[PDB]
Design an enzyme around this catalytic site. Structure first.
Site, short mmCIF file in Angstrom:
data_model
loop_
_atom_site.label_atom_id
_atom_site.label_comp_id
_atom_site.label_asym_id
_atom_site.label_seq_id
_atom_site.Cartn_x
_atom_site.Cartn_y
_atom_site.Cartn_z
N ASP A 177 13.17 4.69 14.93
CA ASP A 177 14.53 4.28 14.58
C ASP A 177 14.64 4.05 13.08
O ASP A 177 15.22 3.08 12.63
CB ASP A 177 14.90 3.03 15.38
CG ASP A 177 16.42 2.73 15.41
OD1 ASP A 177 17.24 3.67 15.24
OD2 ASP A 177 16.76 1.54 15.61
N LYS A 194 16.19 4.21 9.76
CA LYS A 194 17.50 4.39 9.14
C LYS A 194 17.71 3.33 8.02
O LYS A 194 16.90 2.41 7.89
CB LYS A 194 18.60 4.36 10.18
CG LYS A 194 18.53 3.15 11.06
CD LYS A 194 19.47 3.26 12.26
CE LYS A 194 19.44 1.94 13.04
NZ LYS A 194 20.37 1.90 14.20
N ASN A 252 17.38 -0.31 8.74
CA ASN A 252 16.04 -0.84 9.03
C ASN A 252 15.07 -0.82 7.85
O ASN A 252 13.85 -0.96 8.04
CB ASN A 252 15.46 -0.12 10.26
CG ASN A 252 16.21 -0.46 11.53
OD1 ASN A 252 16.87 -1.50 11.61
ND2 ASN A 252 16.12 0.40 12.53
N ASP A 261 12.42 -3.71 12.34
CA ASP A 261 12.98 -3.31 13.65
C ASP A 261 12.10 -2.29 14.38
O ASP A 261 12.33 -1.09 14.34
CB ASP A 261 14.42 -2.77 13.55
CG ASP A 261 15.04 -2.52 14.92
OD1 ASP A 261 14.30 -2.64 15.94
OD2 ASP A 261 16.26 -2.22 14.99
N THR A 265 -9.61 20.78 36.89
CA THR A 265 -9.26 22.17 37.10
C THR A 265 -7.81 22.18 37.56
O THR A 265 -7.43 21.36 38.39
CB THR A 265 -10.20 22.80 38.15
OG1 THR A 265 -11.53 22.82 37.61
CG2 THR A 265 -9.78 24.22 38.53
C1 LIG Z 1 10.19 -8.35 14.97
C2 LIG Z 1 11.72 -8.24 14.87
C3 LIG Z 1 12.11 -7.17 13.84
C4 LIG Z 1 13.63 -7.02 13.73
N1 LIG Z 1 14.30 -6.52 14.79
N2 LIG Z 1 13.78 -6.18 15.87
C5 LIG Z 1 14.54 -5.73 16.89
N3 LIG Z 1 15.84 -5.66 16.76
N4 LIG Z 1 14.05 -5.38 18.07
C6 LIG Z 1 14.34 -7.37 12.57
C7 LIG Z 1 15.55 -6.74 12.26
C8 LIG Z 1 16.21 -7.08 11.09
C9 LIG Z 1 15.74 -8.05 10.21
N5 LIG Z 1 16.51 -8.32 9.14
C10 LIG Z 1 16.19 -9.11 8.10
O1 LIG Z 1 15.13 -9.72 8.00
C11 LIG Z 1 17.30 -9.34 7.04
C12 LIG Z 1 17.18 -10.07 5.93
C13 LIG Z 1 18.36 -10.07 5.29
C14 LIG Z 1 18.83 -10.65 4.09
C15 LIG Z 1 20.18 -10.45 3.70
O2 LIG Z 1 20.75 -10.98 2.57
C16 LIG Z 1 19.89 -11.57 1.57
C17 LIG Z 1 21.01 -9.68 4.51
C18 LIG Z 1 20.54 -9.11 5.69
C19 LIG Z 1 19.22 -9.30 6.07
N6 LIG Z 1 18.55 -8.88 7.14
C20 LIG Z 1 14.55 -8.70 10.52
C21 LIG Z 1 13.85 -8.36 11.70
#
Ligand SMILES: CCC/C(=N\NC(=N)N)c1ccc(NC(=O)c2cc3cc(OC)ccc3[nH]2)cc1
Ligand SMILES: CCC/C(=N\NC(=N)N)c1ccc(NC(=O)c2cc3cc(OC)ccc3[nH]2)cc1
Lengths: 286, 286
Positions: free
Chosen positions: B123, B125, B128, B144, B163
């Site tokens: 995934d 993109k 992420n 993600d 086989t």
């Molecule tokens: C182990 C989990 C990993 C995960 N998503 N996993 C999932 N959806 N299955 C995930 C998805 C997204 C994030 N996003 C961030 O950490 C994030 C930090 C951040 C800071 C920002 O402004 C300063 C704005 C958006 C942000 N996203 C962190 C973890």
């Protein structure tokens, strides 16, 4: 030695079969003094094979009576006194056409039941078909779910709910052929039916220069007219619809159960008779 | 409310991002008084995503600091103060070619590291990809792993040890293309690079009668010369080697890291400088 908890409930007797990764023993359940079979598997895992089989309920699929997770895995089931279908077809032996039909009808019902319940066996062969008795006319059960797979919501289905802005072309192309994994069981049935009717395997490296792989992918089975002259044309017609190379054109279990070869009321009556004979029912209101 | 065990260790603050199935909050770790990010996911599962990420160790892949399995899932990680790459490329905005190269090099290293360790992301993109700071020149991390898959001994490999007397032709044919699942990540990288360089998506339903699906499976990206005239030919050459429709001919991460566009010692020095700046090392003998 055998584990304490098994020895507690069962007295172990002779080996009935053995070979790769395991062994099957005769045993006696102490409580009832009756014979059971115990499958020993050395350490899909067995645990999940067990879980699949505890959920299924069909007279042509084995049931688990007990399970012991020790140094090895010990699985208790009802004894199939007839043993493996393999022993009936080995050495160019063949079954009467009527007997093939009886057995094959049961295999179809069993595999149809699997596919309705989202399970594909993936290792259907004569070694994995058990006979309930030493008579020709008997019930069969399918066993060995070590390679089985559960169908469910695929990765593909989840991918297709979004917009494929970033999605690789090969995933989109795989949409054309997805969801036909079960057809591998239908091909195997076709090979088993061919062996039962004819006494010999459709694809093998015996007296040919065509590789086994090329034989299979081209769908060109070894047809020996003199062996097949005694077999009906309807029987062979079914074989041909199961040994179709395109998995989407291949006969499903349902198509096979509606084929003229299996519209045989005598055969069906024999099956029903064997079922009721096997069963030990409680009293019924009216 | 937040669960007790989380509240015990962290003070929760504002939402940083939100959307489908979850939310990301700013929080402060009480022990250190420092900022962390907390990803909230409503009830591959999260547990196994966590297990995968605890095993990986690369500076361009997120690390898990803490995890709480409550009414919802709460995952604590280091705060990436720059937010999502998405916000840098939305609305036809584009990055300087030099900035794309810096970011893309890091994505390649991260995905190369995944593929060496038997993990495919699936995934990739701009949503992420996280940026470590609000400067253009910063470190990125891939996040993600909800769609990720672990490579290992396949069903196919096990089937081919026996086989294939009873084996369906489609399984044998699938041998030609198996083991290239990782190439889906390379395609996505190609799409991301195209968006970064050009400010617009290669495949979309905007002002065309060709379905998105046909655009993708034919590999015919929307090329707009005037947007690309400012971009180098080496940059575009890499895009073209990643957007190859045949997964076996597609550039791997290794081929991409050896492409002339990425042989840029200035870019590499900038990356190394950002790494050492990020890191808080203990004393060293000699
Ligand atoms: C182990 C989990 C990993 C995960 N998503 N996993 C999932 N959806 N299955 C995930 C998805 C997204 C994030 N996003 C961030 O950490 C994030 C930090 C951040 C800071 C920002 O402004 C300063 C704005 C958006 C942000 N996203 C962190 C973890
Ligand atoms: C839930 C375990 C299913 C299984 N194998 N599973 C596996 N290998 N993963 C399995 C495989 C084979 C058998 N075989 C038999 O029950 C059997 C009964 C029997 C009787 C015989 O003579 C009267 C001769 C051979 C026999 N095999 C029973 C169970």
């Amino acid at each position: 030695v055998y584990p304490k908890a098994l020895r507690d409930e069962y007295i172990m007797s002779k080996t009935l079969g053995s070979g790769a990764c395991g062994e099957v023993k005769l045993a006696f359940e102490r409580k009832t003094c009756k014979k059971v079979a115990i499958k020993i598997i050395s350490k899909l895992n067995v645990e999940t094979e067990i879980e699949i089989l505890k959920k299924l309920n069909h007279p042509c699929i084995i049931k688990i009576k007990n399970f012991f997770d020790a140094e090895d895995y010990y699985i208790v089931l009802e004894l199939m006194e007839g043993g493996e279908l393999f022993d009936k077809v080995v050495g160019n032996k063949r079954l009467k056409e009527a007997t093939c039909k009886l057995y094959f009808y049961q295999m179809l019902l069993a595999v149809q039941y699997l596919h309705e319940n989202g399970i594909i066996h993936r290792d259907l062969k004569p070694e994995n078909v058990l006979l309930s008795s030493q008579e020709e006319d008997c019930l069969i059960k399918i066993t060995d779910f070590g390679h089985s797979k559960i169908l469910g919501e695929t990765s593909l289905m989840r991918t297709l709910c979004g917009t494929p802005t970033y999605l690789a072309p090969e995933v989109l192309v795989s949409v054309g052929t997805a969801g036909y994994n079960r057809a591998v069981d239908c091909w195997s049935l076709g090979v088993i039916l061919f062996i039962c009717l004819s006494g010999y395997p459709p694809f093998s490296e015996h007296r040919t220069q065509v590789s086994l792989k090329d034989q299979i992918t081209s769908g060109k089975y070894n047809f020996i007219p003199e062996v097949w002259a005694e077999v009906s044309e309807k029987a062979l017609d079914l074989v041909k619809k199961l040994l179709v190379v395109d998995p989407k054109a291949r006969f499903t279990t349902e198509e096979a159960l509606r084929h003229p070869w299996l519209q045989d009321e005598d055969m069906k009556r024999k099956f029903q008779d064997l079922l009721s004979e096997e069963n030990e029912s409680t009293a019924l209101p009216q």
